[PDB]
Symmetry: D2
Subunit: 726 residues, 4 copies
């Protein structure tokens, strides 16, 4: 019952392109990739090769195939302690999933700053460009359970645990720069409204249902993040190709005591890229693990996810200078008003070893700050500070969750806390209280100061009465949705319209749809009309007369809010499907793979069955998957080389493959006789922008294809796709 003689069960411990080898635990795939945190886990990493199988008490097992019974057809005996331990451990494997962001995918990596930031913050991890800080990052959706699908329409979470020399800092952000609501007290109302409805627990992974649109219609403060969610920002192509934001105004505190307001950003160095809805939705069924898989395989390939940390910085004296409140988390700060300053780079370069132990049990919380950082009175942030420590008590089984290996600081920690369930640390301190004389008061308080100091809160002035009241400055709900809307390209706007139209069409109570359209009329009449038309709703005269909200501090638009308006394509790490026939022209394939390899673009070789095919020159080509097994949803572009095209010309799956890729705006390249497929997608002889064609696959042919892929999708094709039945 053993490994094959040829050793093909075991993946090479070298970088390999997606699909070339089975995937593996990080420490086995990439044993030479290290950082301080990864090394500190060595105490708890457990191997397996050459070891005897045992109980958890260290007793060797002789027969792991059978229960102990009285005769070989008899009843199982209660003295079988081996059976009961095994079954007991299995019976208790599951722990509660996260209340939100239950679905998530994580990796290890490192961060370093570009230059010292000591003029604006005394945070040790930002103090030296050569101080390297280990990170563990988890990306997530929001609404769905841990076994829901990745490519849903939803906000995405982007949480970073920085293991700094002065403690853990968790930057717990999302992929849009705002949230749906203003005050933490409403968080359970909002989350309950977006989650599956309580009678029947439907729908999973979807805001497209009555309760969510009911809440939105009744709480116009939600409209800004709903605009983001209905745009293609809601359906990213990859965790590598979305932005991150810290959601609130926080403070930086420098050694002199100066406070600067800051908002945090992550810029994807692979560029901004999203799916289209039909693709995204169909992909939740063809591969509900697509983003998890893609993240893992990118890292195994050496296409390490890289992100640039950036800060929007506002001096304390400028708090009131905008037409929105800095502490309102439904408001963004336009980069045209306050530019993002580049701060440093984060590289994710190793996968975990065990998903449960490292991902599922990781606890991130935005209250985990360090000296040099501080909070503000953002009333959403304020409430978050209570929740992320509280929730761990049931999720991770008690207050010793910092001792779970993934959560442990690499910085020293010593204090007078004791006991709690599954206490690991054995304290030797004679004292468990301070002040004490019996241990000469160790461990001791440390004064604040420029570096290695104790934490002190910035002495912000507070003046006001004890009130449950929303600040009047928070009472404006339409100008930021409108700024976002006007900043999108015409195709992005169309996709926003289609997102609202699709979602409200699944709301069963029609008055809810009407009320949401009325809200849309307060943002932009063009948007409101286009949604209304799809829902068979007619705007009233009064609605047609609603005055649009004011510009945001004079802005008519801010192109940094669009995914696509300013080119930022990076093809490295993208993937092409290559549709084989049973006699591929090897000259075409040679040139195709050469050009792809030169830009770091991967290929998957697809056929109508598995196994191998032989090219015209005898080259044997292993088949990664069938046309149906790896649909065009999973790739960025499709190439069909020349050869025995008759072999696949009438294959329904091969034809469909191209109709689907065409519909979803992906570049297609057809060489030699593969040009016969132009008929399936109705391309005129003259050709079409977005379809690359020539007698063979050459320099020019690949250059054109790769240029298209740098632009992500072929937006000009959109008018031509209504008609395709796919």
């Amino acid at each position: 019952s053993l490994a094959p003689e040829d050793g093909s069960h075991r993946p090479a411990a070298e970088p390999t392109p997606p699909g070339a080898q089975p995937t593996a635990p990080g420490s086995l795939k990439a044993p030479d990739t290290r950082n301080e945190k990864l090394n500190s886990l060595e105490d708890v990493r457990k191997g397996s090769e050459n070891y005897a199988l045992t109980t958890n008490q260290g007793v060797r097992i002789a027969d792991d195939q059978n229960s102990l019974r009285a005769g070989s057809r008899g009843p199982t005996l209660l003295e079988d302690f081996i059976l009961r331990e095994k079954i007991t451990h299995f019976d208790h494997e599951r722990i509660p999933e996260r209340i939100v962001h239950a679905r998530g995918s994580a990796a290890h990596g490192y961060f370093q700053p570009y230059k010292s930031l000591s003029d604006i913050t005394k945070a040790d991890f930002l103090s030296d460009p050569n101080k390297i800080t280990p990170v563990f990052v988890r990306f997530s959706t929001v609404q769905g359970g841990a076994g829901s699908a990745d490519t849903v329409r939803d906000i995405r979470g982007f949480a970073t645990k920085f293991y700094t020399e002065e403690g853990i800092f968790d930057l717990v952000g999302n992929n849009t720069p705002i949230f749906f609501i203003q005050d933490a007290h409403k968080f359970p109302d909002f989350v309950h409204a977006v989650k599956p409805e309580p009678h029947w627990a439907i729908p999973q992974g979807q805001s497209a249902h009555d309760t969510f649109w009911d809440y939105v219609s009744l709480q116009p403060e939600t409209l800004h993040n709903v605009m983001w969610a209905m745009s293609d920002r809601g359906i990213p192509r990859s965790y590598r190709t979305m932005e991150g934001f810290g959601c609130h105004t926080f403070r930086l505190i420098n050694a002199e005591g100066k406070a600067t307001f800051v908002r945090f950003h992550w810029k994807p160095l692979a560029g901004k890229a999203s799916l289209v809805w039909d693709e995204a939705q169909k992909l939740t069924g063809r591969d509900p693990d697509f983003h998890r898989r893609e993240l893992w395989e990118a890292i195994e390939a050496g296409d390490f996810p890289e992100y640039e940390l950036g800060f929007q910085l506002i001096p304390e004296e400028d708090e009131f200078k905008f037409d929105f409140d800095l502490l309102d988390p439904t408001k963004l700060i336009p980069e045209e008003l306050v530019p993002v300053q580049r701060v440093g780079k984060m590289v994710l370069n190793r996968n975990p070893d065990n998903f449960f132990a490292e991902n599922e049990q990781a606890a991130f919380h935005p209250g985990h700050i360090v000296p040099g950082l501080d909070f503000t009175n953002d009333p959403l942030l304020q409430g978050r500070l209570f929740s992320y420590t509280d929730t761990q008590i049931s999720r991770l089984g008690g207050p010793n969750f910092h001792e779970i290996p993934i959560n442990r600081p690499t910085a020293p920690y010593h204090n007078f806390q004791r006991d709690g369930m599954h206490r690991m640390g054995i304290d030797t301190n004679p004292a468990n209280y301070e002040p004490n004389s019996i241990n000469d008061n160790w461990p001791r308080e440390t004064p604040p100061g420029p570096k290695r100091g104790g934490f002190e809160s910035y002495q912000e002035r507070v003046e006001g009465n004890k009130v449950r009241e929303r600040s009047p400055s928070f009472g404006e709900y339409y100008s930021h949705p409108r700024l976002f809307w006007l900043s999108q390209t015409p195709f992005e706007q169309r996709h926003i319209v289609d997102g609202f139209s699709f979602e409200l069409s699944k709301v069963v109570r029609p008055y809810i749809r009407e009320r949401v359209v009325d809200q849309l009329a307060h943002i932009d009449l063009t948007l409101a009309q286009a949604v209304a038309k799809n829902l068979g709703i007619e705007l009233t005269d009064d609605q047609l007369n609603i005055t649009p909200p004011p510009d945001v501090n004079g802005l008519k638009k801010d192109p940094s809010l669009s995914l696509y308006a300013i080119p930022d394509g990076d093809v490295k790490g993208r993937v092409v499907a290559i549709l084989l026939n049973d006699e591929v022209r090897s000259a075409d394939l040679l040139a195709i793979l050469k050009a792809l390899k030169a830009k770091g673009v991967h290929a998957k070789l697809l056929y109508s069955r598995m196994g191998e095919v032989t090219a015209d020159d005898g080259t044997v080509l292993p088949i990664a998957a069938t046309f149906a097994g790896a649909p065009s949803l999973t790739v960025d572009a499709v190439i069909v080389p020349a050869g025995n095209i008759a072999d696949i010309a009438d294959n329904g799956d091969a034809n469909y493959y191209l109709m689907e890729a065409y519909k979803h705006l992906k570049p297609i390249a057809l060489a030699g006789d593969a040009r016969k497929f132009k008929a399936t997608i109705k391309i005129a002889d003259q050709g079409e922008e977005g379809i690359v064609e020539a007698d063979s696959a050459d320099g020019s042919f690949m250059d054109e294809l790769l240029t298209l892929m740098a632009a992500h999708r072929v937006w000009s094709r959109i008018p031509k796709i209504d008609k395709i039945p796919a």
Copy 2:
């Protein structure tokens, strides 16, 4: 600095007698003591000197005296994460206590066999006299909570975790050879009956209440262990001075596959010794921690608890050779029939560092056996096998309780179990199932064999129908209680009578006392009538004529059942109270302490206040405690040296000290004018056995006293004590 300039806050890191230094964590008290298990806990030991006080996330705290508030008289702010982390950990410090044996005290040590036992067992830890096995031993009561008193009347637990090279072996025993009930299905009934009654949760740490004696009167199988409990066995002097027993027949299995029946024994090398009831009960008030204290201080002094492991061995073909069933856990195996064969020595030589982490969290379970041992069909043991795994899932929070440091095997452990709450080990195996080819099937099963082989159960024959039935062979309840009774000395018998008499006086419903007397009449008429008289009950003529039960395989007594029939006194580690006066005779004191030192007996110098007094010759004598502070209950003998006896002669506390000690049968020694105290305890001028007296404290004065301490108590004094008002 808060520590005193003279360093008097820090206990000397060397062996010191009780009271000489404050007690300390083990690793600080005795840093040079080691064994394989203590070494392996180093990775979780946390120090404190010279470290900064931090959060659990490693963030330094500047002010650990105040919450964060808006103004120094203002409200506490939700953003104070340092306060909430500290208070959250505190709020969740407690875990469920053990269902039974909640009260207990534990120490590290080591075990070594005297010779290889490979002819009778393949257990690795018994294979080589050079093989040294680390242990962790917890002693306990049974009924009371973790916060109940030590010197209650109750059974005691004696549990030993052996960290062997072939797995953990837990020997989970008690301090009597049998149990109260026959089948594990009744364990919740009997435990509910002894435990505090469910309406009002009274009484703590006591079987002296109606529900206990109701159950016993209705379940005569209980009477054997009840006899043990009512004897002075139920109130041991120390955990160092009681026997241990494994309770059941288990099996040894040798390399040839031969099974031998075995019962386990621990023999205390300090000898057998118990309190008397009045002393034990008062001591639960004066020092409810006395046995926990005595154990910790013995180890700190170098009076390491030592026990000899012993086996009663019965060949398989001898299963039915006795008057009782070997599988009946209410039956003992008399040493007169089957001798205890000596096996090895165990020494407890290090205290824990943190009581919660090491003691409270330790999990012992008798199903934890190793190759070379196996179970039998004892139907109480059979049900134990289920409980001790199950109970851990609530008590220790889940199925990874073997990853809590004290519970970890030192032997290797590898298998395919994954996840659960508090998962520490990060498994790198590509497989989490077997058989697998993707990891060449590792970790792998191991065939049984003479050494380092997999566990295989002994192939015992089973034959019968599926029944809920007690074996008829278990239906005899009186012969063992009778054997035990007849094996006791006349003074041990009197204490048994008084134990029943006192307990049944606290049963409110008179018919329950009557029913128990009826049971005693089935065991022994003398015993029954003597109880009856104390309760004002008269035996009927039918009761007077009940035939006594048969002897046990010809035996009319077995002196190994008596605590005192056969002297096994050892004075090392006992303690003497020395009653000071303001002008002590130094020549007496010098001679007292010299003789006590030579035999390893400790002393405490007591007076009417703290501080010092000065001897006749200027020597400054430090006072340990006041007469009231350290009552006679806590020592084994009392010595009063000569001098200014007038100083203390009319001190009520000093006179009462001698009265209490006299009542409790302790040796008393009076030198010179301290002979004046003879009037307070009514001693005749010619003296009496058990009272040492002379003009001065030597020649043979200390030898006489030490001879009396070797015999533990002055049993001959019993008739004199009823006259003394104490």
Copy 3:
């Protein structure tokens, strides 16, 4: 039938002095003592007389004396679900005890105001002398575990849950008018200092040890409550004979929104009385359940604890 012919196993359901009858669950001792909260608990009370013994799933048990085994001297079978359910429930009976005040004794009663307080508070339970509010009160020590002794020297807790028509109000007090410490941030320090020390877990129910006095000597804010604990306040004769205090300044608020500062008091109508130290300490050995017993029996006897 196992009960005695003469029926002497069953306590009379009438008030009786201490020791005259066996004590009993309160709904069997005093079936006709009612209040709104006692009545509302009827849905969960379970009786026993005349019912068949069953599993928790409602299956009647024939033999509650034995496990199922292959032969009457054979091995116990894994299919014995009756045995396992019974042992499973047993194996999981315990829950964590309270971090502090683990030792405590409780009773049901009622509260009624002497006059309307609407001039100073809109609290509904204080709005009319006719407003009867059920209460459940728990008295406690502070330091010891749930199985520690009653007559230790310690602060006592006095916690009252008022089941009002406008919500639960809990008045969570102690038997002295102040506390040891000023700021909550130090509570784990002070509690760790008074609790059994961490290396060896000694001593139980006692402040008489190095770490408590170490903290006190370093934190003079403690000295006021320390004086109270060292006085005979720290060893009450009975929960019926001690005072209660709300510890903090709270506020009353009236219908006009006017705030008045308030501190709360409970005045024992049985008067104030404490033990002496020697007696209290010895009592922890002779009857560690003394105060729990004395409260239960006072109620059984009609000596109802009353406090103003």
Copy 4:
């Protein structure tokens, strides 16, 4: 015990029998039923031994296992009949 937080999962309303249930089991996390029985053990005299075991019978009887014959050695072995 982990999924539903302890041994009182039968008191979670959907899981409750509609048949009567009474026994001597007590406590556990989330305990809802308040037992008034003076006894929490059997055999007991203080509550005249209630609730009481019930003999097997044709209807409303106690559970008794079928007395199937068992015969063999204690083995971890698959029956050859299963291969």
